Amino acid sequence: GASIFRCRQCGQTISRRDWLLPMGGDHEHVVFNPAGMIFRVWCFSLAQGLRLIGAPSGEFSWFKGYDWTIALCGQCGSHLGWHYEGGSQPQTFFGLIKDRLAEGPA
Numbered sequence: 550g551a552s553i554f555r556c557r558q559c560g561q562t563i564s565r566r567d568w569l570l571p572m573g574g575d576h577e578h579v580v581f582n583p584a585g586m587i588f589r590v591w592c593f594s595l596a597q598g599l600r601l602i603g604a605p606s607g608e609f610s611w612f613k614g615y616d617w618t619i620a621l622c623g624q625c626g627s628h629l630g631w632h633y634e635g636g637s638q639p640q641t642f643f644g645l646i647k648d649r650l651a652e653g654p655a
């Protein structure tokens with residue numbers, strides 16, 4: 550009933566509840582960017598159906614040791630979160646914005 554996450558804007562398949570990743574002890578992290586926008590980020594070890602934009606950047610990174618790339622919905626272009634890489638245990642993961650996903654049956 551609530552096992553997969555889809556893009557809220559279009560329905561694209563994005564991730565699964567089974568793939569939630571407790572980073573630093575919680576899968577949920579609330580953060581702001583330099584423009585003051587607050588994001589409720591859920592960390593996932595894996596995601597699909599995204600389009601990762603550009604090359605990674607360490608600037609303003611919310612997770613120590615990781616560089617990020619913007620992750621858009623590959624279907625509709627909605628900003629769904631970020632892909633993190635260049636770090637350690639794990640090397641990579643996804644930080645997705647909770648309220649931009651819809652949860653539902655597989």
Ligand SMILES: [Zn+2]
Nearest residue numbers: 556559622625
């Ligand atoms: Zn979408």
